[PDB]
Amino acid sequence: DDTSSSINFLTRVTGIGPSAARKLVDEGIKTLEDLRKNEDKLNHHQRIGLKYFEDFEKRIPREEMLQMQDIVLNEVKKLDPEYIATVCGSFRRGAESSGDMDVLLTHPNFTSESSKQPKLLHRVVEQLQKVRFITDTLSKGETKFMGVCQLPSENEYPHRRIDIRLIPKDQYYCGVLYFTGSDIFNKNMRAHALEKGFTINEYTIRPLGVTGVAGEPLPVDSEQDIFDYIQWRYREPKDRSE
């Protein structure tokens, strides 16, 4: 009812899930001003989401994303040029506007065999913090960071969401492929690969076998490799709608 209406509203807050939204209703929290008078019942995540509810409702226009990409790129370089960083999402596809900034990161020192190198990610975050681009953190794992950033005002921009994932170097291309989508494109491509005797996921590409239950990841040093394996002409992200 006009109250279910409430669970629907809450859930528009980053952090607030259903189960998580449901309880706050049982506590008598429904509107937003409810929320602000109630920071204490919210986690740090819910918290920040609440703090920029509006801003996070705004879309990101290309010109901005662009500048944003230059900042991330240029900062990561200075720390270590061996770092590879790719801004994925519809934006990579040429999209006129975006929701957030999804950056995939990698480094040769890190592979799926290592599996343990937080400093690699932390180091960049910190540097972004230091330059004043990242403004807050929602959460920060060993391999993933979710936070907020904003373009340097010279006078102001809305704050935007940003994610940074640390991926092992040997799985990185299958990754940039995946996070680049579209979703159809992925599916279509997984479909084909399959006719070709190959299974693809966000981590790897592996040849099939009898009965089907098969595998053993093929080496990939670029996106192109993937298409080679399935022997499909290479589609640039722009031609990736489906």
Q: Using CA atoms, how far apart are residues 133 and 214, in angstroms rounded to an integer?
A: 45
Strand runs labelled E in 187-226 = 198-200, 205-207
Listed residue (88, 93, 98) closest to 63, CA to CA: 98
Please say whether the structural domain 173-241 has been given the CATH code 3.40.50.300.
Answer: no
100 is in an annotated binding site: yes
User: What does the angle CA 130 – CA 40 – CA 126 come to, to the nearest 5 degrees?
Assistant: 10
170 is in an annotated binding site: no
Q: Find where tokens 């509203």 sit.
A: 9
Strands 144-149 and 97-98, by their bridges, are unpaired
99 is in an annotated binding site: yes
Residues of the chain with CATH 1.10.150.20: 1-58
Assign a CATH topology to domain 59-172. Answer: Beta Polymerase; domain 2 (3.30.460)
Q: Taking a C-beta distance cutoff of 8 angstroms, is the pair 124, 143 a contact?
A: no
Omega of the bond leading into 182 within 30 degrees of 0 (cis): yes
Residues of the chain with CATH 3.30.210.10: 173-241
2 is in an annotated binding site: no
Length of the chain: 242
Tokens at residue 227, please? Answer: 């298409």
- Experimental technique for the deposited model: X-ray
98 is in an annotated binding site: no
Resolution, angstroms, 1 dp: 2.3
163 is in an annotated binding site: yes
25 is in an annotated binding site: no
90 is in an annotated binding site: yes
Class of domain 1-58: mainly alpha
